[PDB]
């Protein structure tokens, strides 16, 4: 359940801060690829018109990152109801060094569980679109290398601002 999930007072600030950090890393990834400035998106000119901060956009420019950043937190609140701030906070948009603190014994299992839940929501979204299909545990190495990059950045975005959600021979 993600649409029928309540958002806390820190979740309203986490939805825009995760969308701002996703735009800041994407503008940092496109600045090295010689992406010029354009009014509309073109693949030939490498134009990007949304090269700005998230606090200077309007309601017509933030709808592509509203539901995608709020459903991931609502699925995280439904898996473990811990949404509070317990630590301090942490175009040429330079993103901060999110690889400062390594993943501990709790964060390494929290990153894989959020990766499996996002794959379960995307597989249900593909099943509802097909009626109107791979598991995360048995996925291929080439597909799991790129799908875990979205889970590692989201856990690095949630680790800032104090919103740290924390829940073969021997067996044979």
């Amino acid at each position: 359940e993600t649409l029928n999930v309540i958002i806390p007072e820190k979740l309203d600030s986490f939805i825009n801060k995760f969308a701002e950090y996703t735009h800041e890393k994407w503008a940092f990834d496109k600045i090295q690829n010689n992406w010029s400035y354009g009014e509309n998106v073109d693949e030939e000119l490498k134009t990007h018109p949304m090269l700005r901060p998230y606090k200077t956009f309007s309601e017509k420019d933030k709808e592509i990152y509203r539901w995608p950043i709020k459903e991931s937190l609502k699925a995280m609140i439904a898996w473990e109801w811990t949404i509070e701030k317990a630590r301090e906070g942490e175009y040429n948009p330079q993103p901060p060094d999110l690889s400062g603190v390594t993943l501990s014994r709790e964060l390494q299992a929290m990153a894989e569980q959020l990766a499996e839940n996002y794959h379960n929501t995307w597989g249900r979204k593909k099943k509802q679109e097909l009626e109107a299909l791979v598991p995360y545990d048995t996925l291929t190495a080439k597909e799991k290398a790129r799908d875990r990059e979205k889970a590692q950045e989201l856990l690095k975005f949630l680790q800032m601002n104090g919103y740290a959600v924390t829940r073969x021979x021997x067996x044979x």
Partner: protein
């Protein structure tokens, strides 16, 4: 003659899944499904297990959870005997 298909990785993988998708059908008789199971048994041999891991991926979701199933278990036993001479 299928030994050494390091040229193309998606054609032999897309063929090996559609034959297994054709191996289970309601409008098929026993004489044709015995050909497809013999065709799938021959093509799981004479090829490297790098491309067979994607079909060993798909069968282990559906065949070992319940005891179509005889040809699938025999192809899995032949692949395991071949590898004896992620995927783990």
């Amino acid at each position: 003659l299928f030994a050494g298909t390091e040229h193309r990785a998606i054609m032999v993988d897309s063929m090996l899944h559609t034959v297994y998708r054709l191996s289970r059908g309601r409008s098929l008789t026993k004489a044709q499904r015995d050909v497809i199971e013999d065709c799938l048994m021959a093509l799981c041999r004479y090829i490297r297990p790098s491309m067979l891991q994607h079909l060993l991926r798909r069968l282990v979701f559906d065949v070992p959870i319940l005891n179509x199933x005889x040809x699938x278990x025999x192809x899995x036993x032949x692949x395991x005997x071949x590898x004896x001479x992620x995927x783990x």
